[PDB]
Amino acid sequence: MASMERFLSVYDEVQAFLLDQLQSKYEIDPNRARYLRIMMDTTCLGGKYFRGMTVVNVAEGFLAVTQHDEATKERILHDACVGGWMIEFLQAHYLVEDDIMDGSVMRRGKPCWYRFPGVTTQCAINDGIILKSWTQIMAWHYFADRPFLKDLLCLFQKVDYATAVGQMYDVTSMCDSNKLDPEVAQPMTTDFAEFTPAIYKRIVKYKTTFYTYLLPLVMGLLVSEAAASVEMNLVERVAHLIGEYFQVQDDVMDCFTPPEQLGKVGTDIEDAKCSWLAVTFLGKANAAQVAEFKANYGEKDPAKVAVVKRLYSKANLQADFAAYEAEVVREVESLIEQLKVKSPTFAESVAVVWEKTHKR
Amino acid sequence: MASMERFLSVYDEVQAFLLDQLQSKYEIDPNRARYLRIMMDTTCLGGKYFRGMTVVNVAEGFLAVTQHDEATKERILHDACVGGWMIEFLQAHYLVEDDIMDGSVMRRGKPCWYRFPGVTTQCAINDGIILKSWTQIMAWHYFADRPFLKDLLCLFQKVDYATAVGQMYDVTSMCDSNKLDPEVAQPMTTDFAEFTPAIYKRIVKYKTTFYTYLLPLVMGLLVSEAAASVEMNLVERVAHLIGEYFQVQDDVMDCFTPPEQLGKVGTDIEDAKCSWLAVTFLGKANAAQVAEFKANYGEKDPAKVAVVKRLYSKANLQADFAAYEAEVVREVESLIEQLKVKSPTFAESVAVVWEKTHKR
Numbered sequence: 001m002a003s004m005e006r007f008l009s010v011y012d013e014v015q016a017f018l019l020d021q022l023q024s025k026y027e028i029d030p031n032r033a034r035y036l037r038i039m040m041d042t043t044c045l046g047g048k049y050f051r052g053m054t055v056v057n058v059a060e061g062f063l064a065v066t067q068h069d070e071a072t073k074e075r076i077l078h079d080a081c082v083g084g085w086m087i088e089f090l091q092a093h094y095l096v097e098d099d100i101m102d103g104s105v106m107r108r109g110k111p112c113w114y115r116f117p118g119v120t121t122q123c124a125i126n127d128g129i130i131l132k133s134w135t136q137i138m139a140w141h142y143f144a145d146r147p148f149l150k151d152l153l154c155l156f157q158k159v160d161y162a163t164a165v166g167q168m169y170d171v172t173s174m175c176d177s178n179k180l181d182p183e184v185a186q187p188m189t190t191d192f193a194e195f196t197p198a199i200y201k202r203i204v205k206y207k208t209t210f211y212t213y214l215l216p217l218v219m220g221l222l223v224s225e226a227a228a229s230v231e232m233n234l235v236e237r238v239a240h241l242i243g244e245y246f247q248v249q250d251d252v253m254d255c256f257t258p259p260e261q262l263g264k265v266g267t268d269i270e271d272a273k274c275s276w277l278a279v280t281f282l283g284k285a286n287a288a289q290v291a292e293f294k295a296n297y298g299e300k301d302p303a304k305v306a307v308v309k310r311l312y313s314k315a316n317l318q319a320d321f322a323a324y325e326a327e328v329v330r331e332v333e334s335l336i337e338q339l340k341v342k343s344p345t346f347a348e349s350v351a352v353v354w355e356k357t358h359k360r
Numbered sequence: 361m362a363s364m365e366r367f368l369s370v371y372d373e374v375q376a377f378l379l380d381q382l383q384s385k386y387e388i389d390p391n392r393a394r395y396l397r398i399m400m401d402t403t404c405l406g407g408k409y410f411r412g413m414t415v416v417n418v419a420e421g422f423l424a425v426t427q428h429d430e431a432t433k434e435r436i437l438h439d440a441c442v443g444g445w446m447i448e449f450l451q452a453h454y455l456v457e458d459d460i461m462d463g464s465v466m467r468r469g470k471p472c473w474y475r476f477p478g479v480t481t482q483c484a485i486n487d488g489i490i491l492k493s494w495t496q497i498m499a500w501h502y503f504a505d506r507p508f509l510k511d512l513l514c515l516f517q518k519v520d521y522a523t524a525v526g527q528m529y530d531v532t533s534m535c536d537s538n539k540l541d542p543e544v545a546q547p548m549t550t551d552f553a554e555f556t557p558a559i560y561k562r563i564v565k566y567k568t569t570f571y572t573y574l575l576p577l578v579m580g581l582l583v584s585e586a587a588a589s590v591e592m593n594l595v596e597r598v599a600h601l602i603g604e605y606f607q608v609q610d611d612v613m614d615c616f617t618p619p620e621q622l623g624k625v626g627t628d629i630e631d632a633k634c635s636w637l638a639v640t641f642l643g644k645a646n647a648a649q650v651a652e653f654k655a656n657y658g659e660k661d662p663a664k665v666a667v668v669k670r671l672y673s674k675a676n677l678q679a680d681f682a683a684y685e686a687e688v689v690r691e692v693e694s695l696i697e698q699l700k701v702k703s704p705t706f707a708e709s710v711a712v713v714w715e716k717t718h719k720r
């Protein structure tokens with residue numbers, strides 16, 4: 001059975017389990033069970049399942065080189081699928097809440113969940129909470145007697161927290177650190193002094209790389225009982241690297257991918273986000289180019305957004321992006337080679353992850 | 361050392377631990393560490409610590425009758441305090457998010473966290489997320505080698521989920537179940553057919569009783585390694601009972617306690633909440649009284665709110681409340697007596713819980 005089919009079948013399984021448990025133990029009625037079923041489908045399905053499928057792909061790699069009974073192989077695959085869905089649901093939580101936080105309009109070519117007529121923000125904040133609770137309900141149900149449950153929960157926990165810290169880094173990224181104060185309304189930075197590579201790196205590392213790369217990779221290792229096939233420091237480094245590159249890609253696409261292929265009208269410029277484009281532009285701009293960026297960035301006026309987009313195109317950031325990508329390729333290949341010392345199999349799963357990231 | 365002092369000292373300890381860990385492992389800067397420190401203080405401190413202190417009180421009861429080394433007594437108390445704070449932080453999460461969900465204005469005589477000038481909803485949704493993540497960071501750090509950690513996490517998890525299900529029961533309580541649909545904007549009920557005791561009971565049981573009574577009681581038992589001193593079905597029943605009574609009390613206070621003692625201007629009438637007042641009024645009203653309730657409930661117009669408050673006073677709900685309270689006293693005393701069979705000590709902790717609830 002192909003990996004995708006198996007992963008989707010487990011969705012249906014987990015969904016049925018969660019809805020049936022709500023009826024048998026949480027006194028739910030059928031209409032609310034329905035609403036929740038539709039919330040789950042709308043918020044968790046539709047993407048490429050890159051995260052959840054990474055878990056499955058890492059486990060498939062170990063299965064190919066490890067002696068197991070058939071029933072054991074099926075168990076391990078089922079665990080990987082469940083683990084995968086945990087990470088997908090974790091994502092779904094973050095996306096629902098982030099869309100609300102940011103007043104976003106669309107996500108994947110459909111309206112953000114909170115904008116559905118019969119949802120609203122008052123329900124959507126809670127639906128997002130439920131999404132994350134379901135990760136834990138799944139884990140405790142499917143993984144209760146598993147040797148890895150402790151390590152899996154502890155890692156999951158740390159990643160979730162990292163992700164929320166990262167969200168804070170991100171939503172504050174256009175404030176001046178020295179002025180942050182719950183008592184005082186926050187002005188946008190005027191100097192852009194904190195739009196640096198180190199700062200940008202910190203935002204992306206927490207907000208995306210831990211849940212998008214490190215969690216799927218390590219979860220594949222845990223459900224495989226293979227975390228001692230690998231050097232964990234290397235897993236982190238490669239995760240953080242490919243993860244930053246995934247986010248530079250999304251930053252570039254926010255600005256330049258037309259909205260039909262992006263699945264939304266990007267608003268990083270209007271929102272004054274600390275993007276790779278902005279940091280890189282500021283790292284090469286002359287005094288006049290800086291001054292004009294400052295007059296136009298972080299304002300809703302489309303004329304001003306167009307001045308920023310012009311500045312970017314004429315600063316030839318395409319070239320900086322090629323250089324960035326070349327350096328990431330060097331470093332990723334290097335880390336893969338290092339991974340081969342203790343696990344050729346895991347190194348190859350990491351190669352596959354890199355390839356899928358490179359080609360999206 | 362008195363229980364309150366010990367509980368507050370552990371706050372400072374846990375806070376220092378969380379902030380120091382953010383700096384050493386999450387690359388935080390001092391200004392964000394500050395912001396988070398102030399968020400934690402503002403959202404977690406200021407109440408009566410009823411929940412967290414219940415954990416401590418249950419553990420103190422077992423300490424008085426169980427032979428332990430001094431260092432073991434101190435460990436158990438420290439665990440209870442940490443466990444207590446978990447539940448307080450869980451509360452703080454729910455309060456931040458609920459205030460946002462509901463567009464609430466005040467909480468405990470201060471502005472809701474999201475309304476602080478330098479917070480805003482975009483940050484506050486995430487700060488609430490962080491609040492809940494901290495419960496898990498505390499547990500894993502202080503409880504990593506404890507025999508009860510598995511049971512404690514699993515219970516915590518189930519209670520959190522119950523609480524989020526309850527929130528959904530509550531925010532939907534003025535819709536007609538048969539019309540819930542994410543695709544269709546939700547009309548307020550016109551018949552009030554779902555304003556019944558059973559339905560009301562379901563809302564309160566999930567939204568409040570699990571995190572306010574069941575969690576503190578059971579967590580005291582777990583950090584005491586005493587869950588086999590008790591009949592768990594009885595703990596649940598007593599929790600659900602005293603818990604419903606706590607919420608009837610809050611419902612009555614929403615309507616009739618003046619805003620300076622309540623700490624906010626209650627808006628259950630404007631919000632069309634399924635309150636004990638509304639259910640009870642509907643259970644005794646004549647046709648004309650029902651018709652007038654329906655013309656006035658769930659509307660912001662203060663004239664209309666005043667008609668609802670008049671209907672309530674003139675329906676002499678004071679008497680229904682006395683009867684309700686008398687029946688809860690019968691049932692609570694009964695369950696305490698049953699609890700005495702296996703644990704006189706735990707029965708007494710439950711007696712103390714009841715007394716504090718009765719007198720607030």
Ligand SMILES: Nc1ccccc1Nc1nc2ccccc2[nH]1
Nearest residue numbers: 197200201276279280323324327
């Ligand atoms: N990572 C990052 C993110 C945002 C802005 C700057 C950087 N740092 C960086 N170092 C490089 C070394 C060679 C090529 C490109 C490079 N980019």
Ligand SMILES: Nc1ccccc1Nc1nc2ccccc2[nH]1
Nearest residue numbers: 557560561636639640683684687
């Ligand atoms: N619990 C509840 C909540 C909201 C509305 C009704 C009720 N049920 C009920 N049964 C009683 C038996 C004697 C006295 C009062 C009573 N209330």
Ligand SMILES: [Zn+2]
Nearest residue numbers: 098101102170
């Ligand atoms: Zn965002």
Ligand SMILES: [Zn+2]
Nearest residue numbers: 458461462530
């Ligand atoms: Zn509420």
